[PDB]
């Protein structure tokens, strides 16, 4: 098989809600070494968001219940860890080094921050520290590039502020920084609504609402 076939199969997998098929297809596309298009990049991200998402959801239910629980929660966690490592591996070997454009570099550095955050959610030992730091390093650099290279209304830039602010609240226990980041991202977008595009404005306005929903919760 080739890129176009694999991508087309990934679209079928998505429609069928078969995300392991979808992730495997996009992983294979990624492994051919060529820079992914915007379409492919989104397919990869959606695929693994779902695969990792099921584990994160099962972990919280099982961790909460916790006996039998501990042994099982560990099973899920190892799956969860293996999935994050798979994605973080693809990011080092292929996606980040080949990101030629600023938008892709931000997208991928955010993804790297995201997947270290998912690892941090379950890290308990003195191992957490290095992981937490890894997530922040990836988030911080992506942040700097998006500020330099993107409009404040850009969906990828707004989305990064969102997840990065979630990082501060959930992982570093810092609601003030979280709020500060979320508010700034929101206000700067509000200040330049003319920079909204036709293809982006829906995403941009939805992400803004999310930022504001987070602000509201965190200062309540």
């Amino acid at each position: 098989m080739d890129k176009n076939e694999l991508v087309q199969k990934a679209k079928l997998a998505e429609q069928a809600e078969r995300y392991d098929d979808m992730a495997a297809c996009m992983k294979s596309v990624t492994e051919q070494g060529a820079e992914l298009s915007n379409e492919e990049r989104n397919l990869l991200s959606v695929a693994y968001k779902n695969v990792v998402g099921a584990r994160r959801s099962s972990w919280r239910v099982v961790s909460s219940i916790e006996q039998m629980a501990r042994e099982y929660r560990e099973k899920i966690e190892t799956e969860l860890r293996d999935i994050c490592n798979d994605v973080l591996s693809l990011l080092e070997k292929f996606l980040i080094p080949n990101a030629s454009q600023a938008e892709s570099k931000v997208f991928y550095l955010k993804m790297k921050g995201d997947y270290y955050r998912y690892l941090a959610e379950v890290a308990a030992g003195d191992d957490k520290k290095g992981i937490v730091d890894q997530s922040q390093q990836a988030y911080q650099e992506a942040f700097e590039i998006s500020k330099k290279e993107m409009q404040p209304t850009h969906p990828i830039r707004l989305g990064l502020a969102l997840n990065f602010s979630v990082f501060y609240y959930e992982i570093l226990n810092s609601p003030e920084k979280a709020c500060s980041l979320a508010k700034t991202a929101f206000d700067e977008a509000i200040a330049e609504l003319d920079t909204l595009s036709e293809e982006s404005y829906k995403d941009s306005t939805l992400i803004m609402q999310l930022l504001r929903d987070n602000l509201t919760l965190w200062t309540s």
Binding site: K49, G53, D114, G159, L162, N163, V166, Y169, E170, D203, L206, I207, L210, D213, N214, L217
Partner: peptide
Amino acid sequence: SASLSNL
């Protein structure tokens, strides 16, 4: 507490 996952 919402991340981008919500879309």
